[PDB]
Design an enzyme around this catalytic site. Structure first.
Site, PDB file in Angstrom:
ATOM      1  N   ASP A   1      -3.519  -6.125  -8.403  1.00  0.00           N
ATOM      2  CA  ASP A   1      -4.325  -5.155  -7.287  1.00  0.00           C
ATOM      3  C   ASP A   1      -3.923  -4.269  -7.750  1.00  0.00           C
ATOM      4  O   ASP A   1      -3.985  -3.758  -8.628  1.00  0.00           O
ATOM      5  CB  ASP A   1      -2.783  -5.636  -6.107  1.00  0.00           C
ATOM      6  CG  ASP A   1      -3.188  -5.707  -4.852  1.00  0.00           C
ATOM      7  OD1 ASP A   1      -4.644  -5.016  -4.899  1.00  0.00           O
ATOM      8  OD2 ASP A   1      -2.600  -5.599  -3.582  1.00  0.00           O
TER       9      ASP A   1
ATOM     10  N   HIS B   1       0.650  -1.248  -0.384  1.00  0.00           N
ATOM     11  CA  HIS B   1       0.037  -0.306   0.335  1.00  0.00           C
ATOM     12  C   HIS B   1       1.055   1.529  -0.422  1.00  0.00           C
ATOM     13  O   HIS B   1       0.180   2.265  -0.655  1.00  0.00           O
ATOM     14  CB  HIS B   1      -0.933  -0.312   0.931  1.00  0.00           C
ATOM     15  CG  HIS B   1      -2.034  -0.762   1.364  1.00  0.00           C
ATOM     16  ND1 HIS B   1      -1.917  -2.139   1.511  1.00  0.00           N
ATOM     17  CD2 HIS B   1      -2.879  -0.521   1.215  1.00  0.00           C
ATOM     18  CE1 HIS B   1      -3.452  -3.159   1.695  1.00  0.00           C
ATOM     19  NE2 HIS B   1      -3.354  -1.986   1.446  1.00  0.00           N
TER      20      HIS B   1
HETATM   21  C1  NAG Z   1      -2.140  -6.856  -0.252  1.00  0.00           C
HETATM   22  C2  NAG Z   1      -3.425  -5.989  -0.005  1.00  0.00           C
HETATM   23  O1  NAG Z   1      -3.907  -5.909   1.034  1.00  0.00           O
HETATM   24  N1  NAG Z   1      -3.407  -5.801  -1.692  1.00  0.00           N
HETATM   25  C3  NAG Z   1      -4.953  -5.964  -0.931  1.00  0.00           C
HETATM   26  C4  NAG Z   1      -5.882  -6.871  -1.786  1.00  0.00           C
HETATM   27  O2  NAG Z   1      -5.820  -7.759  -0.682  1.00  0.00           O
HETATM   28  C5  NAG Z   1      -7.264  -6.273  -1.714  1.00  0.00           C
HETATM   29  O3  NAG Z   1      -8.412  -7.263  -2.472  1.00  0.00           O
HETATM   30  C6  NAG Z   1      -7.761  -4.666  -2.857  1.00  0.00           C
HETATM   31  C7  NAG Z   1      -8.573  -4.633  -3.541  1.00  0.00           C
HETATM   32  O4  NAG Z   1      -9.369  -3.546  -2.498  1.00  0.00           O
HETATM   33  O5  NAG Z   1      -6.967  -3.112  -2.632  1.00  0.00           O
HETATM   34  C8  NAG Z   1      -5.321  -3.957  -2.006  1.00  0.00           C
HETATM   35  O6  NAG Z   1      -4.861  -3.766  -1.121  1.00  0.00           O
END
Ligand code: NAG
Ligand code: NAG
Ligand code: CL
Ligand code: CL
Ligand code: CL
Ligand code: CL
Lengths: 337, 343
Positions: free
Chosen positions: A251, A181
């Site tokens: 992602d 993030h």
């Molecule tokens: C590593 C992690 O947590 N990645 C998340 C993922 O799990 C989520 O499905 C996606 C959609 O909201 O957002 C990302 O930030």
């Protein structure tokens, strides 16, 4: 109309004219919902109906993992355990853990379907090494064989309600320290070490795995590109070595590790994603819709359409009285603290 | 469209041939009919079979259409493109070499099994056998996955996941377990003299552990002498006290075939006894005229909840037509895995 490659979000609890414009764009294929989209079930059901009314072929998704990642937790949505709790149960009673995993999956899916949602971005297949804060209790277990059978049982539950699934974050976010993030995490293991353990659940699940989200992690001994921008990970390993034929969702391209949005989208799709997520900035997502470079999409469209929920679903007023749902609720309450 | 208002009845019977006759249509419209079970004699080729299942649904819109597709020795349709499936024992042997691979292969087998049937308009197969392989029962034999109830559970669960990927339910059999008793319930009345605790510990465990992954059950026509003098499908102790009660089971219960010799412990009386004990549907196979006597003589009145349970056995969602199925990447992957992993 056919689904496009972009999954974006709407501005609020009711659809706006600007949302409707984006939903009609040929490059739109999905909506992802967050907590801010939920006031109560009636409102959410109206919202999803309104989205489908603009774009009939849209896919509607949410992050419903349980524990720390569950957008809708009020007005009758069941608060689901962290997946780590299921691995703890397994350590006490393997067979009961599998039964409870199915019950969790069924509840999860049935309640989402009652509000008109197609899918959840679950299960996390990351291994619980203990190294990653961002994953933490979202991982089922340390042992990839246990992750596989617990996730399979969860996915079975999802399927009982006609819902697909999405394993994440491929090829594994469990070992790397940093949070994608806010930073660019690295994993310096050999390809063989990553394949042996972290990738194993993806391979063993077979048809029980419907889709994948790749990690924004750089696996420095394998490719300098983060996995969701890596042809090596997405084509050579996932499509090639593993023979995977399900959908691949990037992602969130808004995440710091993913660092223009349009360039990153083009790169994700060229590497092998079928859909790209652009969360929490719909105007910037609209720039991507209008700027994205053209590409062959028929094979991606097959996979995206296969993520829609299957068959009829019970509305809430029927679900609340269903013996299976009630049995699943009773099992969750008794088997887990 | 169905012009008449109907609800499914409790009797599952068969039809006389490869195309429906006037007499079949009469039986299919009878209020007490709820299903059709197909046998090898109902299969000439896929085109004929698909026309037959379509014709059945046209007479009775809510009818459930079932077949015994287990694999190995029990598979009614084996030609015109149907994939010949392994005996379930083969999956237990694979497990003994590679547990995780076995689970992956079990799902592939389930998906192929169900998808092929869906392409021909069939709702469900009476699979999985959850009987344990003690090596005692000839009638079961290689139809059992494994000796160990934990292995039976997880292989059957993985099979049922494959079936569910194609929108198909399942039916565990033969409850509380046909694997320990020696005799064949087709031609004799088998007995099992173990204590309730022994039977619950091993043979019943898969039914408990599967949870929602188990959609339905067929009880064995076996007398468990320490628990009830009645065969399990006529026993309120087995069906209400253990299965509905202790195990909290909410799915459909189908009697085993009432035409079997063990079931003689008349057809109409046996059907009424099975339904009274807890069955939602009764099977009457290979004697349609005798089944029709049962239809017209049956005393049982079905509950709304039996009707719900029967309706939930219908296949879900859209199915691919044969020509689309055989070009589908996932079906092709499943076929390749069967070919490589079971060699
Ligand atoms: C590593 C992690 O947590 N990645 C998340 C993922 O799990 C989520 O499905 C996606 C959609 O909201 O957002 C990302 O930030
Ligand atoms: C013990 C046994 O084999 N019972 C079979 C059952 O498996 C099958 O589903 C049913 C309908 O054909 O016929 C019974 O004879
Ligand atoms: Cl609602
Ligand atoms: Cl496979
Ligand atoms: Cl349950
Ligand atoms: Cl397809």
């Amino acid at each position: 109309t056919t689904p496009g490659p972009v999954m974006l979000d709407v501005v609020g609890t009711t659809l706006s004219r600007d949302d409707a414009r984006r939903l009609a764009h040929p490059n739109t294929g999905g909506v992802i919902l967050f907590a801010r989209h939920f006031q109560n079930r009636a409102q959410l059901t109206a919202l999803t109906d309104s989205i489908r009314a603009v774009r009939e072929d849209i896919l509607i998704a949410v992050d419903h993992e349980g524990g720390r990642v569950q957008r809708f937790r009020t007005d009758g949505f069941t608060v689901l355990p962290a997946m780590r709790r299921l691995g703890e149960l397994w350590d006490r009673d393997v067979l009961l853990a599998t039964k409870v995993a199915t019950a969790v999956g069924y509840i999860l899916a049935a309640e989402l379907r009652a509000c008109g949602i197609d899918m959840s971005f679950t299960p996390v297949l990351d291994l619980d090494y203990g190294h990653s804060k961002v994953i933490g209790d979202r991982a089922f277990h340390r042992d990839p064989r246990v992750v596989t059978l617990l996730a399979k049982s969860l996915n079975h539950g999802l399927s009982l309600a006609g819902m697909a699934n999405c394993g994440k974050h491929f090829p594994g976010h469990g070992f790397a320290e940093a949070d994608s993030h806010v930073a660019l995490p690295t994993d310096d293991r050999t390809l063989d070490a990553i394949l042996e353990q972290d990738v194993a659940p993806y391979d063993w699940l077979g048809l029980s795995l419907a889709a994948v989200i790749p990690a924004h992690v750089i696996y420095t001994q394998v490719d300098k590109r983060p996995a969701g921008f890596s042809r090596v990970w997405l084509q050579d390993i996932l499509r090639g070595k593993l023979g995977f034929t399900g959908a691949i969702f990037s992602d969130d391209l808004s995440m710091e590790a993913a660092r223009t949005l349009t360039q990153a989208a083009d790169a994700a799709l060229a590497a092998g994603c079928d859909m790209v997520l652009v969360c929490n900035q719909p105007d910037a997502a609209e720039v991507v819709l209008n700027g994205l470079k053209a590409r062959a999409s028929a094979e991606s469209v097959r996979r995206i359409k296969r993520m829609r929920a299957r068959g009829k679903a019970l509305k809430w007023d029927k679900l609340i009285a269903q013996p299976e749902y009630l049995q699943a609720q009773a099992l969750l309450s008794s088997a887990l603290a």
